[PDB]
Each structure stands twice: as structure tokens, then as C-alpha cells.
Design a protein around this ligand. Structure first.
Ligand SMILES: CC(=O)N[C@@H]1[C@@H](O)[C@H](O)[C@@H](CO)S[C@@H]1OP(=O)(O)OP(=O)(O)OC[C@H]1O[C@@H](n2ccc(=O)[nH]c2=O)[C@H](O)[C@@H]1O
Lengths: 20, 697
């Protein structure tokens, strides 16, 4: 197996929708 | 009214960007009150709800937006982000790909999809998706900064200098405009950012926790101000998602059981479920109280539980890493809260009072790097359970294929007993070293390795191939149990040369930058018969390292790559190296302890960040100041002297082999005692009615 390491979740980008 | 609802939704978007999430939620809800079938408002509301930790309520509104508008790509992509946070990888994937299917030019969806590939270990696919996102939207901080980390992981250094410039420029612009930086607080240690920038990045990530607990509207907790309720004992709570098979437990699993029960009551709060390993078993059994907070996902109720136990000192072992629930610390269920061991840096957050470190790791002249007050351990804050986990490596013997201490090595609990049956064994003074001559027994052992046999039996003793530990005992390979057999480890197992100096580094490749490889190249050039030993960590980084080394004048055969190994083999095979070359950008931490337990000298050059100073702290505690460089020239000179002056190498290697036992570095009993003295200083200070201050003794 790959050894367990110190891990961090990658941030994602929320999309804000402008109303027209 | 169209205009009315539209204005409410758009103003709420503005409030969201400003960091006023409460007002955003308010405006989104008024928009939906005016116009119930408002798809954009449903999706936008779900986003701020997600940011508030209300994930299930977010999903409901995302689905409502999509029911109203089936081709609403933003809603799919945003919903994917929520599912990803919920650890629903497949669900997140299906949302991202649907969003991209609706709109192939949707840059955000490509970048979000990339994060799934990144966290799955599919770096090439992550890179490709991030590049698609940046092709569609060139100004995209999230995509660029995560792409940069992807490139760091595989050691792609194409335009590295301009990459660093862009990263710093991005962080500066984001901090100025009060945004959450696109650079993760852990990753920030890898880039030439200021200490002020790094601490600010951390601070803003800590602010995310405040957004999640503010909606709970819980009042501040009343804290104990004496030890009366606990019969004079101090109640310490260790909070970690890593009680199980994780480097954290490999370091501190013995510590809860070694606390003095006359003065301390140990509470362990697990943020993860039982993984069925001996690591988890040991902590559950030896802690006075073990609490599975993974059964209590509501942060309000979890913090309530901690408070009901009457915890005096709550210890944060996660920082900004996976499985963390720093919302618990933001609620302050304890009067004293400390960062310890797990996270190599500042929290940047006000809800953390102390960071447990040491004078070597965190000198007072760089104290502005941390938001917490400094709390000094007398030697090093670092610790490992190596003496308990791998005692079979306390002693070793070699086979003389003719004398080397690291070409053909045997280790074992019953090694001494086995050697008693071999009357032709010579004891060479270097504790000294037993040497098996090239006899019948030695030839049988060597035949086993050459033929890839699993194990043989000699005089009743089981002799194991070091490459085959998992086939013999899974628990022994993971470090869950001590190996019972005599294990054989050879340079031939890894394609290492028999008559040359081996410099090693067993860290993930991300810790290597161009400057480090250049420094390593200078060393290899000055030591004719020497190779560099690295890991396929990951394998796709290998051709990159090889290319850059060739460009630096190093032939390809000078660098030897091995696969990552099970825990036990990884520590054990460190014995085959002559010297470890530590990474200055970010030191080996756990891997630093791993190599020193094998008796291998480590050369290091401490920087300014915590992460770049840990190895020097370990070596200072070990008692080998001569292995700590003050600059790059000295780093190279030390390494070259070790590789060319063979008597000096023998002296230094013997020093490490002895002092790993005699120094306090791997002494968990002594560590626990001194940690207890520090806890008491923290308590008395608080109990005297004082706000936290530097406990630098
Ligand atoms: C910079 C940073 O994140 N520092 C953290 C520290 O601050 C924390 O205090 C340490 C405990 O939480 S974790 C971390 O410490 P690091 O030294 O970076 O290790 P990292 O997270 O890459 O893991 C590699 C593992 O694989 C094992 N390993 C390695 C090679 C191998 O072939 N086999 C193997 O089992 C090794 O034994 C390791 O167990």
C-alpha cells in the first residue's frame, strides 16, 4: 500500500450566479 | 417582482464576497420569499449554507434549483463541492461531469473536477483539468495555486521562478482584498512568502471555523478554575482524527498510557472511527477515557461533551489537515487550548492559546511567525514510538562477503540467540558488531535473497527476506506488531551499489525544490563513488528529477529510485544508507525520526519556518550538532566529509547508533514527564488569573 501521510483536502471553487 | 428578487439575490452575492455570510443568508431567503421559484437564489443560498456547515440543507436547495432549471450548470458544480466535502467522491464526480457536459467552457467545474483527481492521487489528470480551467479563465487563483501544488508534487519545475512570483502576487492581492487565500496554510511553507503572509493565510482558514460555529449561537462555556472536581488531577484532552494507522499514532501512541495517573487524567477524543488497527486499540486501552467523537458529528454536541468531562487543557493534534474539527476548539470548551505535534505550523487563530514547540524549532526571534504563545519543551517537541514499535532494530549483525556495516544486514529479537549457535562469528569493535563469515549459513541466506525466497530455517530460527514481510506477517509490516523472525536486508534488494556511498532521502518528492537538488548535485560531484537514494513518492516525479539532475551535470545512474514500502521495511532499509540528506525547504519530520532510529546520520540546514527547523531540533536533542549546517556551503561540506572521510563516517554513524538509545530523543517516558511539567506551568499560570504568555522556561 501507499503509506498514510499528513493529508489536506483540496479547496474547491463555488460559483456565484448573478440574476438577470 | 423580477427586479425585486434579482436585486436581493445580487446584493446577497456582494455580501457573501465581503465575508458577511449572515446577511447573505438573510437576503437570499428574502429573495426566495419574494420569488419562490428562483433557481439562482436557491443555488446561491445553498452555497452560503455549505460555508456554514449546513450541508444537507444545502443539497436540498441545490436540487430545488436544478428542478426549476435542469441545465443550471452552476448548481451542479456547486452541489459537487458540497458532496465532496461530505466525502461523497462518486457523487461529486457525477455533478462535475454533468456540469461540464452542460457547459464545456465552465472553468470553475473543470477546476473543481481537478481537485477530485488531485485528492485521488491522479496528479496528471488533475494537472490537465486545472490547465483546461486556466485556458478558459486565465485569472483563476484557485486553479493556478492548486496547479502549482500539483507541479510541486511531481517535481515539475518548468518556469518555477515565475510560478513562485505569481503565487506570492496572488496571495498578496487576496490578503489585501480580504479574501480566503487560494494557497492552503500547510502548502504556504513551500513558497517564498513572508511570515506575515503565512500566518494571515492560516488566520483566514481559522475564520472558516467561526462561520460554522456562529450559527450554533452557543454561549461561552464556564471553565474550571481549580482541580477540586478532579481530585487534584489535571484533565488533559487529546483531540485527533489520527488515532489509528497514521504517522501521528506512530509518534505518540505510547504517551497517553505513560501519563502519571496520580496527577493527570487522560481523555482521548477521536475524530475518526475505529480502523481496527493495533494503534487504535492501544490508545483506547491505555487512555483513562476514550471518546469516539465520530459518533457525534454535531460540533455543538461534541464540544458540549468535552466540556462535561471538565477538560482543563484541550490539545489540537490536527491543525489544518484532513479529519480536523477545529470548530471544537473555536467553541472553547476548555480554558487552555494547545497546538501539539500533528500540525507543523501556526493555526493563526485566536481560539488557540499555545503551540508546544522548543527553542531550536521556534526561537524567540521568529516568534511573530506564530499567533499562539510559545510553549517550550526542554529538548525537542518531536517524539516517536520507534523504541516500542521497532525494538528488533536495536541490534544488528552483518555478513562479510569477503568490513561494511550496511551492505548485508540482519536484525531480530532472537538474533543474539541465533548467533550463539554460530561459533565462527567474529565480533568487530566499532555496543560493537557481530560479523558472520562467508560460510554455509551465510551462503544459504544470500541464496534466499538472490532467489527471492520468502524465508528459510536455520537451527530452528526463521530467517526472513526483508522484501517479503507482508507475506509473513501483515501486522509486523505495518508496525502494529514486532517482527518475530530474523530479517535480512541487503543493498542488492534495492539495486544499491556495493562499493559506494549512499546518500538517502525518503520524503515525499514535494519537499524537493530546484535549489535542493542543485545542492545535492554539488555533493555528489565532490564524492566520486556516491549515489542518491530516493523514493517513487509518487513515481511520476522520477523522470522529472532525473532530467533536472542531468541538466545539473549528474549522470542518470547516480540517482536510484525505490518504491514506497510498508512502515517496518521503510525504517529498516534506512540501515543500508551511509548518510541522509535532509530537505531544507521542508524537513523530514516523521521520516527524520525514522532515519535516525536506523542509526543513519542526517545532514540538515534549518531555515526560519517551523517545518524547516524540525530536523535540527531532532539532531540537537540527539546530540549531533556537527550534522547541523548554518548555510548551504556547510551543508555540502559536512555531507562531502562524511562521504570521503571514511573514519569520520564510522565515528558519526557509531555516535547516532548509540545516542538514539541514550539521548532523550526516543524516550517516550521522559518526554511524557516533561510534557507534564509544561502542562502544569500552563495551568498554574492560568489559575493565577493570567492570560496565556510565553512558557519559555
Ligand atoms: C510537513 C508535514 O506534514 N510534516 C508532518 C509532521 O508535522 C507530523 O508531526 C507527523 C505526524 O502527524 S506527519 C508529517 O511528517 P513527514 O515527516 O512529512 O511525513 P509525511 O506526512 O510525508 O508521512 C510519510 C509517512 O509514510 C511513512 N513511509 C514513508 C516512506 C516509505 O517508503 N514507507 C513508509 O511507510 C513514514 O514513516 C511516515 O509515516
Amino acid at each position: 500500500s501507499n503509506p498514510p501521510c499528513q493529508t489536506h483536502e483540496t479547496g474547491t471553487t463555488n460559483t456565484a450566479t448573478t440574476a438577470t | 417582482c423580477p427586479t425585486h428578487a434579482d436585486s436581493l439575490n445580487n446584493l446577497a452575492n456582494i455580501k457573501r464576497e465581503q465575508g458577511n455570510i449572515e446577511e447573505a443568508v438573510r437576503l437570499y431567503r428574502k429573495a426566495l420569499e419574494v420569488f419562490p421559484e428562483f433557481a439562482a437564489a436557491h443555488s446561491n443560498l445553498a452555497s452560503v449554507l455549505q460555508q456554514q456547515g449546513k450541508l444537507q440543507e444545502a443539497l436540498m436547495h441545490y436540487k430545488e434549483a436544478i428542478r426549476i432549471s435542469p441545465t443550471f450548470a452552476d448548481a451542479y458544480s456547486n452541489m459537487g463541492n458540497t458532496l465532496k466535502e461530505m466525502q461523497d467522491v462518486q457523487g461529486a464526480l457525477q455533478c462535475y461531469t454533468r456540469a461540464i457536459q452542460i457547459n464545456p467552457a465552465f472553468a470553475d467545474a473543470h477546476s473543481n473536477l481537478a481537485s477530485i483527481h488531485k485528492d485521488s492521487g491522479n496528479i496528471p489528470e488533475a494537472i490537465a483539468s486545472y490547465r483546461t480551467a486556466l485556458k478558459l479563465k486565465p485569472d483563476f487563483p484557485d486553479a493556478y495555486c492548486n496547479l502549482a501544488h500539483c507541479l510541486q508534487i511531481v517535481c515539475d519545475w518548468t518556469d518555477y521562478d515565475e510560478r513562485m512570483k505569481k503565487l506570492v502576487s496572488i496571495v498578496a492581492d487576496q490578503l489585501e482584498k480580504n479574501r480566503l487565500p487560494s494557497v492552503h496554510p500547510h502548502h504556504s511553507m513551500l513558497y517564498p512568502l513572508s511570515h506575515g503572509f503565512r500566518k494571515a493565510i492560516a488566520e483566514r482558514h481559522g475564520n472558516l471555523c467561526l462561520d460554522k460555529i456562529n450559527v450554533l449561537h452557543k454561549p461561552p462555556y464556564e471553565h474550571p478554575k481549580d482541580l477540586k472536581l478532579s481530585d487534584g488531577r489535571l484533565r488533559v484532552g487529546y483531540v485527533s482524527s489520527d488515532f489509528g494507522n497514521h504517522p501521528t499514532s506512530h509518534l505518540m501512541q505510547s504517551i497517553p498510557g505513560m501519563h502519571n495517573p496520580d496527577k493527570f487524567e487522560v481523555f482521548c477524543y477521536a475524530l475518526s472511527p475505529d480502523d481496527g488497527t493495533n494503534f487504535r486499540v492501544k490508545v483506547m486501552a491505555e487512555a483513562n477515557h476514550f471518546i469516539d467523537l465520530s459518533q457525534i458529528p454535531c460540533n455543538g454536541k461534541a464540544a458540549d461533551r468535552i466540556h462535561q468531562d471538565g477538560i482543563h487543557i484541550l490539545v489540537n493534534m490536527n491543525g489544518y489537515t484532513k479529519g480536523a474539527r477545529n470548530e471544537l476548539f473555536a467553541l472553547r470548551p476548555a480554558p487552555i487550548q494547545a497546538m501539539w505535534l500533528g500540525y507543523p505550523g501556526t493555526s493563526g487563530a485566536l481560539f488557540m492559546d499555545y503551540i508546544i514547540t522548543d527553542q531550536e524549532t521556534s526561537p524567540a526571534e521568529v516568534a511573530e511567525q506564530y499567533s499562539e504563545k510559545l510553549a517550550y519543551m526542554p529538548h525537542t517537541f518531536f517524539i516517536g514510538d520507534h523504541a516500542n514499535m521497532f525494538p528488533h532494530l536495536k541490534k544488528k549483525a552483518v555478513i562479510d562477503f569477503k568490513i561494511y556495516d550496511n551492505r548485508i544486514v540482519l536484525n531480530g529479537i532472537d538474533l543474539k540467540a541465533f548467533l550463539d549457535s554460530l561459533p565462527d562469528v567474529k565480533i568487530v569493535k566499532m555496543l560493537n558488531m557481530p560479523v558472520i563469515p562467508m560460510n554455509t549459513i551465510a551462503e544459504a541466506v544470500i541464496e534466499m535473497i538472490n532467489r527471492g525466497q520468502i524465508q528459510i530455517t536455520i537451527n530452528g530460527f526463521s530467517i526472513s527476506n526483508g522484501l517479503a514481510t507482508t507475506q509473513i506477517n501483515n501486522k509486523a509490516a505495518t508496525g502494529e506488531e514486532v517482527p518475530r523472525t530474523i530479517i535480512v536486508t541487503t543493498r542488492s534488494q534495492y539495486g544499491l551499489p556495493e562499493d559506494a556511498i549512499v546518500y538517502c532521502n525518503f520524503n515525499q518528492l514535494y519537499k524537493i525544490d530546484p535549489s535542493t537538488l542543485q545542492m545535492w548535485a554539488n555533493i555528489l560531484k565532490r564524492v566520486p563513488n556516491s549515489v542518491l537514494w530516493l523514493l517513487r513518492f509518487p513515481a511520476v516525479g522520477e523522470p522529472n528529477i532525473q532530467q533536472y539532475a542531468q541538466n545539473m551535470g549528474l549522470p542518470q545512474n547516480r540517482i536510484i529510485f525505490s518504491p514506497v514500502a510498508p512502515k517496518e521495511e521503510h525504517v529498516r532499509r534506512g540501515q543500508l544508507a551511509d548518510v541522509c540528506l535532509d530537505t531544507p525547504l521542508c524537513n523530514g519530520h516523521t521520516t527524520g525520526m525514522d532515519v535516525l532510529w536506523a542509526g543513519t546520520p542526517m545532514v540538515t540546514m534549518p531555515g526560519e519556518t517551523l517545518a524547516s527547523r524540525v530536523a535540527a531540533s531532532q539532531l540537537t536533542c540527539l546530540g549531533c550538532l556537527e550534522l547541523i549546517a548554518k548555510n548551504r556551503q556547510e551543508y555540502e561540506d559536512i555531507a562531502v566529509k562524511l562521504g570521503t572521510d571514511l573514519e569520520y563516517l564510522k565515528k558519526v554513524r557509531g555516535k547516532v547508533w548509540k545516542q538514539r538509545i541514550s539521548s532523550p530523543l526516543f524516550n517516550t517516558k521522559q518526554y511524557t514527564m516533561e510534557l507534564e511539567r509544561l502542562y502544569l506551568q500552563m495551568w498554574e499560570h492560568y489559575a493565577a488569573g493570567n492570560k496565556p504568555d510565553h512558557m519559555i522556561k
